[PDB]
């Protein structure tokens, strides 16, 4: 009914990004990265029962990390770093996502300040918000209890 | 499950600590600290309507930090560091708590890996879990959406 909204982690560059329909079920996340997180996109079923394909936020290019999820496989842990890269002061530089199936996905290069959200009980990540320009300046999460 | 349970951050020393009645409303937090977090205690109204006085977890001593909260003032941001201190490898070394009234409370000395939970919308911290022995080895939070 009410999602928990946590973040964002990263700098103040770029423009605010968000979703207008709260997610109910996260189906996929696609990240592009080099030495920093270059884009994020994600696909979910809204609380309205409709499917949304969000993004990409950021300029992309680099190498892809494609995370596919569903009714039983949930994101249970997300962490990363944010800091200086490519002559910018504070960018999301690295992301690590762990699902309930013990599938681990990593993007970028650890560099800067840590953040981490390990979820217990039934909590899981269902969506994102943040800031983007050419890169992902900052990232935040929506958490389904 | 109505609360979001996040964490813990810190090492694997000490013994697991937790609460059994889910919190509805957090009324106060008491922290003792030196170069590390030496104890935490808190009191809350449970979902059963009863008041609970939890802790102290940890051995305490040092300087006290007393955080008082209520129906309008609650914890919107909690952050900290964990890592080596004294002759130990991974302890909660520092905590910063910010309330909806823009009251900020700090305990310990920043040292080690960062963690941070900045809550948006209606989310707020209502309780804690973690690990303790002589000190607070690790700390986690319960979040009310
Ligand atoms: O996204 C990284 C960077 O991209 C562009 O240079 C601009 O949008 C900046 O404001 C932003 O910080
Ligand atoms: O709490 C810090 C330290 O205190 C005690 O001596 C023991 O419980 C340890 O296992 C613990 O790591």
Is residue B42 within 8 A of residue B30, CB to CB? The reply is: yes
Positive/negative CA dihedral, A28, A118, A123, A132: negative
- Going from the Cα of B112 to the center of ligand 2, the distance in angstroms, rounded, reads 18
Query: Is B7–A120 a contact, with Cβ atoms under 8 angstroms apart?
Result: yes
Half-sphere exposure of A36 (CA within 13 A, CB side): 27
User: What does the alpha-carbon distance between residue B52 and residue B39 come to, in Å, rounded to a whole number?
Assistant: 17
Q: Collect all residues of chain A within an 8 Å Cβ-Cβ radius of residue B92.
A: none
User: What does the alpha-carbon distance between residue B90 and residue B82 come to, in Å, rounded to a whole number?
Assistant: 6
Q: How far apart are the first and last CA of chain A?
A: 9
| Residue A20 φ/ψ region, left for φ over 0, alpha for ψ in the -120 to 50 degree band, beta for the rest | alpha
Q: Collect all residues of chain A within an 8 Å Cβ-Cβ radius of residue B4.
A: 4, 119, 121, 123, 143, 145
Determined by X-ray
Is residue B72 within 8 A of residue B46, CB to CB? The reply is: no
Could you state, in order of their start, the residue ranges of all structural domains in chain A? 1-145
CB B12: neighbour CB atoms within 10 A? Answer: 11
Positive/negative CA dihedral, A30, A90, B113, B125: negative
| Structure tokens belonging to residue A73 | 């496989």
Atom of ligand 1 nearest to the CA of A15: 8
Q: How far apart are the first and last CA of chain B?
A: 11
User: What does the alpha-carbon distance between residue A27 and residue A4 come to, in Å, rounded to a whole number?
Assistant: 18
Q: Is the peptide bond before B8 cis (omega within 30 degrees of 0)?
A: yes
Q: With the CA atoms of B126, B82, B61 and B129 taken in that order, what torsion angle do they form, in degrees rounded to the nearest 10?
A: 30
| Top CATH class, A1-145 | mainly beta
User: What does the alpha-carbon distance between residue B31 and residue B58 come to, in Å, rounded to a whole number?
Assistant: 10
Among residues A56, A5, A14, A6, the alpha carbon closest in space to that of A31 is found at: A56
Grouping H, G, I as helix, E, B as strand and the rest as coil, residue B106 is strand
CB of A88 closer than 6 A to ligand 1? yes
| Structure tokens belonging to residue A141 | 């999460």
Resolution in A: 1.7
Q: Count chain A–chain B contacts defined by CB atoms under 8 A.
A: 62
| Structure tokens belonging to residue A7 | 């973040």
| Structure tokens belonging to residue A56 | 């990409």
Please give the angle made by the CA atoms of A82, A86 and A89, to the nearest 5 degrees. 50
**Bridge partner list, A112:** none
Percent of chain B as helix, strand, coil, to the nearest 5: 0, 65, 35
Among residues B99, B42, B105, the alpha carbon closest in space to that of B75 is found at: B99
């Amino acid at each position: 009914m009410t999602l928990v909204k946590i973040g964002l982690w990263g700098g103040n560059g770029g423009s605010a990004q968000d979703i207008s329909v709260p997610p109910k079920k996260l189906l996929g996340v696609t990240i592009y990265s080099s030495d920093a997180i270059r884009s994020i996109a994600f696909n979910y079923i809204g609380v309205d029962g409709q499917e949304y394909a969000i993004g990409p936020w950021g300029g992309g290019e680099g190498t892809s990390t494609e995370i596919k999820l569903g009714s039983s496989e949930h994101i249970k842990e997300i962490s990363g770093t944010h800091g200086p890269v490519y002559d910018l002061a504070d960018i999301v530089t690295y992301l690590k996502i762990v699902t309930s199936a013990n599938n681990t996905y990593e993007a970028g290069v650890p560099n800067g300040k840590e953040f981490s959200i390990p979820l217990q009980d039934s909590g899981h990540v269902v969506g994102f918000f943040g800031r983007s320009g050419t890169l992902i300046d900052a990232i935040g999460i929506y958490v389904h209890p």
